[PDB]
Amino acid sequence: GAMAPSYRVKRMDIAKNDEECVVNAANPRGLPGDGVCKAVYKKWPESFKNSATPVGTAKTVMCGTYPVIHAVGPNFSNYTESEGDRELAAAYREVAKEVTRLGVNSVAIPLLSTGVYSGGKDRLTQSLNHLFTAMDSTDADVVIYCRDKEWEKKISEAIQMRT
Numbered sequence: 001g002a003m004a005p006s007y008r009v010k011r012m013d014i015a016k017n018d019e020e021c022v023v024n025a026a027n028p029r030g031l032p033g034d035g036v037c038k039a040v041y042k043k044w045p046e047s048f049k050n051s052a053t054p055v056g057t058a059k060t061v062m063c064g065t066y067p068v069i070h071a072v073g074p075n076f077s078n079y080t081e082s083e084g085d086r087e088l089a090a091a092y093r094e095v096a097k098e099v100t101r102l103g104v105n106s107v108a109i110p111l112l113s114t115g116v117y118s119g120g121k122d123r124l125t126q127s128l129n130h131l132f133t134a135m136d137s138t139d140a141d142v143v144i145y146c147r148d149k150e151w152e153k154k155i156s157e158a159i160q161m162r163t
């Protein structure tokens with residue numbers, strides 16, 4: 001574990017992380033996709049060998065020795081708010097099991113079920129609270145990667161609020 005487990009947020013490309021493993025905002029089919037998924041595909045394409053996995057699950061594939069944890073958040077265009085919420089919580093619980101299993105001291109993570117999976121809605125608070133619920137019991141340093149200047153501020157405030 002980390003000596004004093006922490007949360008941090010950075011506004012930059014998760015493909016340039018300084019952590020021991022990465023969480024991909026994957027699709028269920030292991031396709032290159034767009035946004036974070038496409039950035040992960042460009043940096044670690046070997047990790048998309050048999051990466052397909054259902055909604056609400058996480059599947060780890062090694063790129064060399066570097067673990068990519070493919071986490072599949074629901075697409076809120078297809079799910080009810082109720083069922084979407086349940087699957088988004090579940091995907092994060094599966095990320096926490098994999099981070100633990102791998103024995104890493106740090107993990108880079110994006111906010112799942114945002115952007116194209118958001119169903120046209122700001123889900124910063126919903127996605128961040130499910131991330132905390134899952135990762136609070138892990139001792140890895142968690143570095144959250146974001147792509148909105150306002151989101152960086154709000155995520156940073158939510159981390160400080162709890163400390």
Ligand SMILES: COc1ccc(C(=O)NCC(N)=O)cc1
Nearest residue numbers: 011012013014039146147148149
């Ligand atoms: C390539 O990864 C990133 C990382 C961050 C951003 C971003 O913050 N864009 C919105 C803005 N410039 O306010 C975009 C892409």
Ligand SMILES: COc1ccc(C(=O)NCC(N)=O)cc1
Nearest residue numbers: 114115118120121122123147148
């Ligand atoms: C109002 O609909 C939306 C839908 C999606 C977002 C969102 O995820 N923004 C952050 C990002 N692009 O990473 C915000 C608002």
Ligand SMILES: [Cl-]
Nearest residue numbers: 011012013016
């Ligand atoms: Cl960058």
